[PDB]
Amino acid sequence: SAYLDHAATTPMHPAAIEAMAAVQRTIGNASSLHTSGRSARRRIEEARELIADKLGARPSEVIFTAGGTESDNLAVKGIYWARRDAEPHRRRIVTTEVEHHAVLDSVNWLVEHEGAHVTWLPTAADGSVSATALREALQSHDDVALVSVMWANNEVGTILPIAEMSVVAMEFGVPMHSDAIQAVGQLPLDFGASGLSAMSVAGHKFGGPPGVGALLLRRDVTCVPLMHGGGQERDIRSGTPDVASAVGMATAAQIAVDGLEENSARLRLLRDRLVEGVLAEIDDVCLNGADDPMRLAGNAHFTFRGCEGDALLMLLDANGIECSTGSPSHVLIAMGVDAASARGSLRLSLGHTSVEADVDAALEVLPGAVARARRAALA
Amino acid sequence: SAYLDHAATTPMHPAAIEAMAAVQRTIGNASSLHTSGRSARRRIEEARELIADKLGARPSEVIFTAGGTESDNLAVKGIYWARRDAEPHRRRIVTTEVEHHAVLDSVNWLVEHEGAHVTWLPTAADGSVSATALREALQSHDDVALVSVMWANNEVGTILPIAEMSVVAMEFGVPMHSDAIQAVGQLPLDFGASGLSAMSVAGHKFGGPPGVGALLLRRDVTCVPLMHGGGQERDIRSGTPDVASAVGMATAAQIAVDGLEENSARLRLLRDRLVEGVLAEIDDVCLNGADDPMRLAGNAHFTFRGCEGDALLMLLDANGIECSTGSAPSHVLIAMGVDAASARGSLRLSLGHTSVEADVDAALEVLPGAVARARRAALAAAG
């Protein structure tokens, strides 16, 4: 298969499979007092430090989770609660319209279930949000519980201005969370140096085990737990510590962040060649999202007029090209593209294992496939 | 080096390690519509089916979680909320005082934060709780949102009468959850045959990978999610499905539950040899928790008068005997009527699928010396 669905998941690094199988062969609960316990404990502590190192955090800032979704729920609901509980006036969530469901659905739920209110930051046709728009919604609202803004979008690849949005949030004394699940090993990540109160990351998105993640959280931000007890993870997130998955995520984190520079460069070329080929050989197609240097290196997103994206995906699949439609995408809606127009969408995404031929394959196959999808949609 | 802490974690089955390795070698998101995706989906759905079969559930009753803590949390909070939100008067949780912390602390947080109320069922000297006591609690309260009683205790080994308690809950139309985390691979569990609205399990306790569990939940019992953004698992629990872990948990479930009868009897003989040994060679000691036939096959739990559990543990460890104090002074012993002073010299020795004769021999050899040192160490620090 030509695999071009890296943004949905990317192949686990062989070395991470190996490091993880080796933990699995030793016995021990990291919570236990005996020799096996203190070993496991020391392995989980080394993984935590390697992770913090590679994300510009301090080891104690890393709260392991069972994936991106968990991490995003914890930040959003946890912090909302902590803030609302201490000052019941503070009920407003400021967030973007282009968030992953993991955030949006968390937000909508706090709204329906927890008396939350939400202000949606306006979105550019880019798919971006700006530091100013944040300042404007912060100044005109005295009831901001928290802020959540994603670092890079997972459908259209737009990088957001987090660093400078963070300094804004700091200014108003408002904790800011960012979903950086698409960022690890794709752009430079420095938790400490960003202003962030909280940051989400997900193993499998950079060659880690699936079912493991982290929330980076600052020592002084209160967060009400979603999982009780008794707080194996800084009293924020209970459950028996999963050492094998932490170790897996660490090895991954290390390969992926050390290779950040070289790999970005390699994927930009591959992706630009793909974007170029696509627009050269196909009529009525456009790129969505931002241009360099405000886009993920590995991401290509199109709309093909007069197509169903589902038809398209199935025809490409039949020919050995594996990709995704991305989702009527709330993210394209947010960028002011229209319902009809938008159903013709396709995300093609590359990662550590992509090669020239994967691009040669997509370009070979695509025109035949878009023709067929258009024929079919014409009835 | 004798491992006697199987109740905290049991060694992963090597076939479960292999199956999991194999999955992580293939690429695919189970929610993806292309070929690799459909393969991932086909793999997770088979694991699910294997798990259902082995636990007497229908496939769609199985919801994958990140472990037993997640599973207990989802059941207790999520069903509470589903009940409270439908009839704001049902705010009461009926539970036992012996529950694992993942239930106690969930119950507590609901009390502190979500307006819950709690009635604690009375606990016998045994560690045990009865169907009658549940009856009286449901007759005498008209506001109960949810019942949660664990199938077997993780400290003292006691098995509770879930089938007959489940029936009582059914008669007052109140959903019941049971933490069965200790029961899988040690007891014949059949979600179908029990009346349970819900039941929790954790892979690592019967030899599956860490950070994977399941909640078994009836098709008609509503449950508010704790993880949103998906919800990939019947809309109850979001997250990209973890295919490797679930296949692992399945490979383990089929070994654990097929070996059930054989393993059970084998551990009984070991445990019993272990308990008899201890009581012969040591003074002022007792066994805690119910007797056969209401006790897990691999669980031995003792109190030694005149010890700190910690010094005793460190001594045993120094001599290659690895075990636990159980907690957390144990809330379980407190609830069985054991006083906090007496409580303090407690020790859980727990057998599992890799347990061999030599393990019990090692414990029997080292124990008298250990106990005697712990007693002397306790007197001299009071001195």
Total residues belonging to chain B: 383
| Helix, strand, or coil (residue A322) | strand
The answer, for B212 touching chain A at a CB cutoff of 8 Å, is yes
How far does B30 lie from chain A, in Å, by closest CA? Answer: 10
Integer Cα distance of B105 and A59 in angstroms = 26
Distances (CA, A) of B212 to A134, A236, A312, B330: 39, 19, 35, 26
Q: Are residues A254 and A315 in the same domain?
A: no
The answer, for B192 touching chain A at a CB cutoff of 8 Å, is no
Q: Are residues B120 and B222 in the same domain?
A: yes
User: Looking at beta carbons, which residues of chain B come within 8 Å of A317?
Assistant: 33-35
Integer Cα distance of A203 and A249 in angstroms = 5
How far does B73 lie from chain A, in Å, by closest CA? Answer: 6
Integer Cα distance of B64 and B48 in angstroms = 8
| CA torsion angle B294 B300 B303 B307 (round to 10) | -170
Among residues B259, B282, B313, the one where a domain terminates is: B259
User: Looking at beta carbons, which residues of chain B come within 8 Å of A101?
Assistant: 228-230, 238
Q: B378: domain CATH number? A: 3.90.1150.10
Residues 10-29 of A with CB under 8 A from B: 10-12, 17, 20-21, 24-25, 27-29
Q: Are residues B296 and B251 in the same domain?
A: no
DSSP string, B6-44: TTT--PPPHHHHHHHHHHHTS---TT--SHHHHHHHHHH
| Helix, strand, or coil (residue B257) | helix
Q: Are residues A230 and A278 in the same domain?
A: no
Between A and B, how many residue pairs show a Cβ–Cβ distance under 8 A? 210
User: Inter-chain contact A105–B224, Cβ cutoff 8 Å?
Assistant: no
User: Looking at beta carbons, which residues of chain A come within 8 Å of B17?
Assistant: 21, 24-25
User: Looking at beta carbons, which residues of chain B come within 8 Å of A29?
Assistant: 5, 8-9
This PDB structure is determined at a resolution in Å of 2.6
Among residues B259, B287, B319, the one where a domain terminates is: B259
* Residue in A24, A105, A322 closest to B209 by CB: A24
Total residues belonging to chain A: 379
* DSSP annotation of B325: -
Spatial contact of B351 and B298, defined as CB atoms under 8 Å apart: yes
Q: Are residues A234 and A126 in the same domain?
A: yes
Q: Are residues A250 and A279 in the same domain?
A: no
Terminal Cα distance for chain B, rounded? 34
User: Inter-chain contact A113–B224, Cβ cutoff 8 Å?
Assistant: yes
Terminal Cα distance for chain A, rounded? 30
Residue owning tokens 């993210």? A331
Structural domains in chain A (count): 2
Among residues A235, A259, A283, the one where a domain terminates is: A259
**The tokens of A142 are what?**
């005295």
The answer, for B69 touching chain A at a CB cutoff of 8 Å, is yes
Q: What is the extent of the structural domain holding A151?
A: 13-259
Q: How many CB atoms lie within 10 A of CB A372?
A: 16
Q: Are residues B20 and B146 in the same domain?
A: yes
Is B101 annotated to bind a ligand? Reply is no
* Residue in B29, B230, B323 closest to A5 by CB: B29
Q: Are residues A248 and A355 in the same domain?
A: no
**The tokens of B5 are what?**
């802490």
Spatial contact of B73 and B225, defined as CB atoms under 8 Å apart: no
Maximal CA-CA distance, chain B: 73
Integer Cα distance of B359 and B193 in angstroms = 36
Q: Are residues B52 and B192 in the same domain?
A: yes
Q: Are residues A3 and A103 in the same domain?
A: no
Burial grade of A140 (CB within 10 A; 0-12, 13-18, 19 or more): exposed
Integer Cα distance of A43 and A66 in angstroms = 18
The answer, for B45 touching chain A at a CB cutoff of 8 Å, is no
Q: Are residues A2 and A83 in the same domain?
A: no
Spatial contact of A93 and A146, defined as CB atoms under 8 Å apart: yes
User: Inter-chain contact A9–B108, Cβ cutoff 8 Å?
Assistant: no
Q: Are residues A231 and A264 in the same domain?
A: no
Q: A183: domain CATH number? A: 3.40.640.10
Long-range contacts of B372-377 (CB under 8 A, 24+ apart): B373/B311, B373/B315, B374/B304, B374/B306, B374/B307, B374/B308, B374/B311, B374/B312, B374/B315, B374/B345, B375/B304, B375/B306, B375/B307, B377/B308, B377/B311
